[PDB]
């Protein structure tokens, strides 16, 4: 019900941190 | 449980969005 996007959101957050660096 | 990690991920995503902008 809520764990489907748990992976895609985490990955996208990782690449956003990449642009931040 | 994992929902707390989800909430932390959402907060960090918002913070990264603000910092990136």
UniProtKB/Swiss-Prot annotation, chains A, B:
It comes from Chlamydomonas reinhardtii. The chain holds residues 294 to 314 of 471 of the full protein. This is Dynein regulatory complex subunit 4. Belongs to the DRC4 family. It is found in: Cytoplasm, Cytoskeleton; Cytoplasm, Cytoskeleton, Flagellum axoneme; Cytoplasm, Cytoskeleton, Flagellum basal body. It comes from the Eukaryota. Disruption phenotype: Defects in DRC4 give the pf2 phenotype characterized by disruption of the assembly of several other N-DRC subunits and an altered waveform that results in slow swimming cells. Component of the nexin-dynein regulatory complex (N-DRC), a key regulator of ciliary/flagellar motility which maintains the alignment and integrity of the distal axoneme and regulates microtubule sliding in motile axonemes. Plays an important role in the assembly of the N-DRC linker. Component of the nexin-dynein regulatory complex (N-DRC). Interacts with DRC1, DRC2 and DRC5.
